[PDB]
Amino acid sequence: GSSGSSGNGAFFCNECDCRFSEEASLKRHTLQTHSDKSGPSSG
């Protein structure tokens, strides 16, 4: 798919499977859901 598409919604989490209408909405999820320090972070 190339630039130009009816209706926004082209942001899907890379780590997990999800969708977000806005970019800001996704970014947050990525952090909250997948905190920068979660994997090696025992807790």
Smaller CB separation from Zn ion, 10 or 16: 16
Q: Shortest approach of Zn ion to residue 4 CB, angstroms?
A: 26
Site for Zn ion in 1-43 (CB under 5 A): 13, 15-16, 33
Smaller CB separation from Zn ion, 8 or 12: 12
Q: Identify any residues that bridge with 20 across adjacent strands, giving them in sequence order.
A: 11
Amino acid at 3: S
Alpha-carbon span 5 to 15, nearest angstrom: 24
Number of C-alpha atoms within 13 angstroms, CB side, residue 20?
A: 15
Which residues of this chain interact with Zn ion, rule CB under 5 A? 13, 15-16, 33
